[PDB]
Amino acid sequence: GTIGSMAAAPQVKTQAPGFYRMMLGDFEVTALSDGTVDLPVDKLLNQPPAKTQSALAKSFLKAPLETSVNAYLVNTGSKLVLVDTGAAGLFGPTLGKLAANLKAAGYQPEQVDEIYITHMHPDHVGGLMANEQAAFPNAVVRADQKDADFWLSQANLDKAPDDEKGFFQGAMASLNPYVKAGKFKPFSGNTDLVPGIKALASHGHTPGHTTYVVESKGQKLVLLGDLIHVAAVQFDDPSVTIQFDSDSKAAAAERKKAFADAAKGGYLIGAAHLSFPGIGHIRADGKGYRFVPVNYSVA
């Protein structure tokens, strides 16, 4: 210890760098942490708090629930693509770790060729911008036209209630460097993006919410964005929606489709708000689903 064996070295406390490497056929996937943030999931989920409390207890959890914010880097061998970008400073002092974690993972933001945005919530697009400038100076940003039409519209910002105006302001501030520079390239619905990566519409959580399907050599990873927020509730009961959903009915429907398809297909998913790295399989489990986190692997 510091003093004989009577006093240990001080506790270091800090977490390991938030990146996780996973091969997927010929492709290299790097899950990137933006950090975590506590969520009042009792208030946010669209069911009685008592039910949320019972469900959290089953999983040895309590509200407020420390919730991951993840993004996913894909190096296809010919392109470097990033799926989502975290919050930068749009959502409190515990997020915005992605820039540091990308560097820790061995890449620089100049190397990113394209960025695919699941949806234009602040915890997905915030990381696009630092000091009025593009954080990724060479990237083309792609998102669904229905999200661009909704979140980048001054009319919508103007009629939004005061506590929602921030989400539009954040989207505009985040996507503007790219739009001005001719590096925002929308798509409409299901779209081939770069070989091995496709946009799959999963509209509901937002109007243009998009899933990204990544596949190489028979190995498939479906990046689901915000089709789930609270694993301890919404695997067992996928019908439970959340206040953050623009269209709760559509959001539930999309989640159920995605879970059913993953169960049937036996492929990996990655989800922005599953515990970091947020990657795993899904199996059916009666009326709900069971998440099977990916086995730890090292090259």
Place this chain on the structure above:
Amino acid sequence: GTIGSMAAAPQVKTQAPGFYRMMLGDFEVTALSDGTVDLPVDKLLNQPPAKTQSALAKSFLKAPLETSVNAYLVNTGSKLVLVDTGAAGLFGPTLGKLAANLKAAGYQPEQVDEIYITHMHPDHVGGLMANEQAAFPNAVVRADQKDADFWLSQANLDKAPDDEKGFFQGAMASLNPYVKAGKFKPFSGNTDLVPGIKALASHGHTPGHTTYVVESKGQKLVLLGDLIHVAAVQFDDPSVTIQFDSDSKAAAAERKKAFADAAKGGYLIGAAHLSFPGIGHIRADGKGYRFVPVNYSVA
């Protein structure tokens, strides 16, 4: 491409540092990865390969199975203690990562006060020695007297079949610096070690296999060593044993007792061969058990 187009970015491939920080009351726990190693679990498990193949498929796995090798650092404030040490180079080129991961975690070997060994298999004690020297030059090493007297006895080496002689050679070489320097301190069965950490006999896997029970401010973590090897088989069916067990009957009995106790108590377990970081809760699930990995947390 256009003039001076750069080649596409090569894949980095290297994994993030294998450490995971977790607070346990006043104590800081650092799970340390020694790497992974593939195991032919279809052959090693004491049931027909078909049943193992079926179980693995259910969890989207297949043999050979990439198996984590974990150790656990605990900073109690008055002591820095390390539970197991990985393999160094005793079990191939994919292990022995503990030393680098300890450094990444913010500690040096010379800071470690005591080392508690669950059992003297190579993948638990190899990390004690480098260059015929103590890798941890201030530490007292502790293990069950029954394990010391089994593995560190020349008669048992010389009776062992050729393919098992390595385990005794490795144990002897790993412990020798400490034994020579008077820094190996055995215990016999259930023992208080330092405030907040106790040895709990869990004999079977080896003659002196020991569980370490860590507790602070009502928060308990039970470090189970090798009570489990193949989560995808042995949680659903704790009766299935493995060729690595010295006494398979006792091993199965100890595994069942520990799972039942953890389910009842609702406390955390950490296990050497559960996917890194190997920390979670256990709940009863019909005739077997379900592991609930800890939620990703960042200070």
